[PDB]
């Protein structure tokens, strides 16, 4: 499918060279950054969407995530489906696991306090996570059947908001350096 949304946010720290490529392709070169999120996807997320991607390059030197990323409103929720990471594997309050697209993911919940949200400014909100138990190999055509995660989260009392915001396959980093090249469809 054709992507219609380009996400390129940075808190201004360090260098974040984000390139909006042709079609669903994008690349990022970052160094000594603060927090940033870059990716391509859809303006309106959907719990029934099946995301396809191919990370031709995944080379974080420190803390960075290759993850499906999105938000919902009412309530405000930031969610993730992490397929790979750098030096740090994200975790939180363990809820259970879900098997999907050949891998096993741990389900976690966390809370952010006085942090920047999609609406701008700062606030306190909940984060939903699905983190692969082991890093998914990159360079191949990968699939993320989001419906499997949404259903698993629901079973653990993790319900998403009613107003859907953007949904993208992103590269997120925190105080690190690295390179990535991803194609989404």
From Swiss-Prot:
Annotated keywords: Carbohydrate metabolism, Glycosidase, Hydrolase, Polysaccharide degradation, Signal, Xylan degradation
Entry-linked Gene3D superfamilies: 2.60.120.180
Cysteine pairings via disulfide bonds: none
Annotated pathway: Glycan degradation; xylan degradation
E.C. designation(s): 3.2.1.8
Presence of the UniProt keyword Hydrolase in the record: yes
Name this protein carries in UniProt: Endo-1,4-beta-xylanase
Source species taxonomy: Bacteria, Bacillati, Bacillota, Bacilli, Bacillales
Gene that this sequence comes from: xlnA
């Amino acid at each position: 499918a054709s992507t219609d949304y380009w996400q390129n946010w940075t808190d201004g720290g360090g260098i974040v060279n984000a390139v909006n490529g042709s079609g669903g392709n994008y690349s990022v070169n970052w160094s000594n950054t603060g927090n940033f999120v870059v990716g391509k996807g859809w303006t309106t997320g959907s719990p029934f969407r099946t995301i396809n991607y191919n990370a031709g390059v995944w080379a974080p030197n420190g803390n960075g995530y290759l993850t499906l990323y999105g938000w919902t409103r009412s309530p405000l929720i930031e969610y993730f489906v992490v397929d790979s990471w750098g030096t740090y594997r994200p975790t939180g309050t363990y809820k259970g696991t879900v098997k999907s697209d050949g891998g096993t993911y741990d389900i976690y919940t966390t809370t952010r306090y006085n942090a920047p949200s999609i609406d701008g400014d700062r606030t306190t909100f909940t984060q939903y996570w699905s983190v692969r138990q082991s890093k998914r190999p990159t360079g191949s055509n990968a699939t993320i059947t989001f419906t499997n995660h949404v259903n698993a989260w629901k079973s653990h009392g993790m319900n998403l908001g009613s107003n859907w915001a953007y949904q993208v396959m992103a590269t997120e980093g925190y105080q690190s350096s690295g390179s990535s090249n991803v194609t989404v469809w």
